[PDB]
Design a protein around this nucleic acid. Structure first.
Ligand SMILES: [Mg+2]
Ligand SMILES: [Mg+2]
Ligand SMILES: [Mg+2]
Ligand SMILES: [Mg+2]
Lengths: 233, 118, 102, 67
RNA sequence: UCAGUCGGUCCUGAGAGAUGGGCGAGCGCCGUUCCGAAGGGACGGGCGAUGGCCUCCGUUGCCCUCAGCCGAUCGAAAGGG
RNA sequence: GUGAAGAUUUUCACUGACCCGGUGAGGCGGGGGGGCGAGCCGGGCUCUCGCUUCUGGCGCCAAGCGCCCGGCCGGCCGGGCGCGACCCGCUCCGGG
C-alpha cells in the first residue's frame, strides 16, 4: 500500500563529506560593540572582587515575599494626574456648594524622612545604573533602625507610582486594616537585612572565574588528588 | 527562531514619508522656460534661406537650456507644423542655432513667408 | 645637511613595492574546524610564476564545507607538486610532500 | 538629602568602594568612542552644582581626551 | 561648426578621496577595511487597498523567507567600450 | 589586578585590564550518548575514536519519521512543529 519510490537519502555530515547544515550559531555571532560591551561588563562584575557595599544589592528578597510586598504596596498607590484633577474638582464644587497616607518616592525624599526615622519600611531597587545614588542608604537605614529591603527591578518598583523608574519607595504610614500585614512583613525584612548587617558588610562579591578556567583547574586538581591519595593509601 | 549566519546586520526598520505641516514654498515656481522664451528669433541669413528653400527645414536661434524634444514641441505648438527632426549646435557667439526639419507634408517656404521671414 | 637615501627610503614615495602584476599574497587557508579535527582535500589547478618573487605559486581549490562554493587559494609551491594533484590540509592529513599539517 | 551623601562619597575616591566604580567606568568609557552622548549624567549632584537641571534642553556629552 | 552609429558621457589601471575610527589647541590631519548595527534589494508565499469588461493582471502598503562581498565616490577625447 | 610557595622582596601560577593573529567572528569548555584495544567479576573504572587517500567527476536550497492544523467531495489539495543535525554554559576562537 506504500509507494516503492519513497526512499530515504540520509546526509552524512562528515568532515569534508557534505555541506554543513544551517544549525544554531547563537554563540559565534559577531555581536555589535554595544551588545559586546553590555555583556562583558556583567562578566567583569562577576570577575572582579566586588566590595560588600556594592554586592549587598545582589543579595535580594525572595519571590513570595516580593510579591507579598507588591500586594501591600498596591493599596497605597499615589494619585494619577487625572484622578488628582478629579479630586480638585470635587473639592472645588464642594466648597462652592483628610488625605490618606501614600507611598514616598524619590531618593532625596526617602533619605530625608529616614534620617529622622519617620518611616516604617524602605524598598530599594537593585538596578540603579550608578550605584552611588543608593549605596549609602542600606547603612543609613541600619543605623537609624528603619527596616529596609532590596527589590529586583526599578521598573516594577517604579510602576507603583505612575512613572517609568523610581529608585526607592518608603512606607511611612499604613491604615488600620493593613497594620498587621505591615508588621509581619517588617519583622521578616528586619531579620533578613537589618539583623544580619555585620555579615552583609563582611560579605564580599565577585571573584569567580569563568567556566573554562574553573573546569581546567578542577580537572587539574582532580587528576593530582586522585593520583596522590589513591596510590598512597 | 535561531541565527544561521555567524554575522550580525542591522535589522530593517520602518521609515515613513514626508508629511509637512506647511509647504516649504508657498507656490510652485512659475515655468520661466515656456514655449515663447525657448525660441528667440529665426535666422534670416542667406545660408539659412538657401537651407529652407532646399531641405524643407527652418532655422531658429534659441537658448542653451533647450532640449531637442523641447524645441520640437515648442515649434509644433507655436506654428501647428509637424517636425521631422531637430539638429542643434551652439554658435561661437553663445546662442544655440537649431535646424528644424519639417514633416514632408508641410512646405518650409510657405511656413517662412507666413511667419514673417522672407 | 641633506637627509640621506637611507632616510628617504622610509617615506614610501618612489620606493614602494611594485605589486600590480603580482597575483596575490601566498597565504595558507585560515584555521577552521576541518583542519582542526580532520582534513580537507584540494586539487592543484595550476602553477603560476609570481613577478618579483623567486618562488612559484600553486592555486589550490578546495570545497567549502559550510556553503556550496569552491574556495581558491595560493600556496607556496613545493617542488615535486604538479597540477591535478590532491593536496590534503589538516591535522589528520598524512605526511607527504604537498600536504600541510600542524 | 541624598546629594550630601553622594558628594561626601565622591570625595573619598581612594577607598575601595569608589575605586571599583572608577575603574569599571574608566574601562567602559574607554571601550566607547572619543565623543558620544550620555542620555543621563553620571554625576547628578555635580551636574546640579555646575548648573545642570533635569529638564528638556540639557544634554550630557561624555568625551575622552588623550592624557 | 547640424551625429543613437565620430569622441566625451560608461568601466577601471597607477593614484586620489569621504563615512566608521583615531589624532589634533585648532583650520583640520592620518587612515581606505582598518577599534563599524556598512542590505533600502529580491524569486516566492501570506494579509490588506485601488484601477481596468473588478476575470486576471499591474502599481503598491505590511509581514514571512532568501541574499556575501570590499568598500561612497573620482580618476584615460592614445587602455576596455 | 587575583592566588600559592621561599626569604617588603623572589619564583611559580590565573586573566580581567592591555597587546597581537584569523574569520563571512562557522562547530569553544564541560556533560550525555554510539564504536574501537588493555587489564577484573551479562556488569564497573581509566584511556581512545567520532565516519572523506588509486583517479583533474558530482555534492547547497533535506529525504525519512513522529505529532498537530485548514479547505473540498474513506478519498483529493495545501500548511505548521520536533528529531533528523544531542544538552548546558560567562567571555568568537587562538597566542602573550
Ligand atoms: Mg541618419
Ligand atoms: Mg585624506
Ligand atoms: Mg567615471
Ligand atoms: Mg577610450
Amino acid at each position: 500500500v506504500v509507494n516503492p519510490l519513497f526512499e530515504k537519502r540520509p546526509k552524512n555530515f562528515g568532515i569534508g563529506q557534505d555541506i554543513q547544515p544551517k544549525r544554531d550559531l547563537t554563540r559565534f555571532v559577531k555581536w555589535p560593540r554595544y551588545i559586546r560591551l553590555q555583556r562583558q561588563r556583567a562578566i567583569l562584575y562577576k570577575r572582579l572582587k566586588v566590595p560588600p557595599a556594592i554586592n549587598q544589592f545582589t543579595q535580594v528578597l525572595d519571590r513570595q515575599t516580593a510579591t507579598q510586598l507588591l500586594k501591600l504596596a498596591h493599596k497605597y498607590r499615589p494619585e494619577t494626574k487625572q484622578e488628582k484633577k478629579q479630586r480638585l474638582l470635587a473639592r472645588a464644587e464642594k466648597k462652592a456648594a483628610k488625605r490618606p497616607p501614600v507611598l514616598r518616592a524619590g531618593v532625596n525624599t526617602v533619605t530625608t524622612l529616614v534620617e529622622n526615622k519617620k518611616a516604617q519600611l524602605v524598598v530599594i531597587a537593585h538596578d540603579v545604573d550608578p550605584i552611588e545614588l543608593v549605596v549609602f542608604l542600606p547603612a543609613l537605614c541600619r543605623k537609624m533602625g528603619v527596616p529596609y529591603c532590596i527589590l529586583k527591578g526599578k521598573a516594577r518598583l517604579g510602576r507603583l507610582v505612575h512613572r517609568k523608574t523610581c529608585t526607592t519607595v518608603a512606607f511611612t504610614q499604613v491604615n488600620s486594616e493593613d497594620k498587621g500585614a505591615l508588621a509581619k512583613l517588617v519583622e521578616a525584612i528586619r531579620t533578613n537585612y537589618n539583623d544580619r548587617y555585620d555579615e552583609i558588610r563582611r560579605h564580599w562579591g565577585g571573584n569567580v572565574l569563568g567556566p573554562k578556567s574553573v573546569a581546567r583547574i578542577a580537572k587539574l586538581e582532580k587528576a593530582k588528588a586522585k593520583e596522590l591519595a589513591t596510590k598512597l593509601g | 527562531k535561531i541565527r544561521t549566519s555567524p554575522t550580525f546586520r542591522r535589522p530593517k526598520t520602518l521609515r515613513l514619508r514626508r508629511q509637512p505641516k506647511y509647504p516649504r514654498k508657498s507656490a510652485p515656481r512659475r515655468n520661466k522656460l515656456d514655449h515663447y522664451a525657448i525660441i528667440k528669433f529665426p535666422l534670416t541669413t542667406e545660408s539659412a534661406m538657401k537651407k529652407i528653400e532646399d531641405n524643407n527645414t527652418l532655422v531658429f536661434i534659441v537658448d542653451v537650456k533647450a532640449n531637442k524634444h523641447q524645441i520640437k514641441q515648442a515649434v509644433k505648438k507655436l506654428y501647428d507644423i509637424d517636425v521631422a527632426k531637430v539638429n542643434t549646435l551652439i554658435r561661437p557667439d553663445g546662442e544655440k542655432k537649431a535646424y528644424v526639419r519639417l514633416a514632408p507634408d508641410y512646405d518650409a517656404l510657405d511656413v517662412a513667408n507666413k511667419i514673417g521671414i522672407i | 645637511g641633506r637627509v640621506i637615501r637611507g632616510q628617504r627610503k622610509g617615506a614610501g614615495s618612489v620606493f614602494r613595492a611594485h605589486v600590480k602584476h603580482r597575483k596575490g599574497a601566498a597565504r595558507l587557508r585560515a584555521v577552521d574546524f576541518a583542519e582542526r579535527h580532520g582534513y580537507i582535500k584540494g586539487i592543484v589547478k595550476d602553477i603560476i610564476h609570481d613577478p618579483g618573487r623567486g618562488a612559484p605559486l600553486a592555486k589550490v581549490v578546495f570545497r567549502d564545507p559550510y556553503r556550496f562554493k569552491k574556495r581558491t587559494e595560493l600556496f607556496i609551491a613545493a617542488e615535486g607538486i604538479h597540477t591535478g594533484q590532491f593536496v590534503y590540509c589538516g591535522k589528520k592529513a598524512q605526511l607527504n610532500i604537498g600536504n600541510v599539517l600542524p | 538629602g541624598a546629594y550630601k551623601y553622594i558628594q561626601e562619597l565622591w570625595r573619598k575616591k581612594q577607598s575601595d568602594v569608589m575605586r571599583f566604580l572608577l575603574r569599571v567606568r574608566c574601562w567602559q568609557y574607554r571601550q566607547l568612542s572619543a565623543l558620544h552622548r550620555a542620555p543621563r549624567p553620571t554625576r547628578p549632584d555635580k551636574a546640579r552644582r555646575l548648573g545642570y537641571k533635569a529638564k528638556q534642553g540639557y544634554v550630557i556629552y561624555r568625551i575622552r581626551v588623550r592624557r
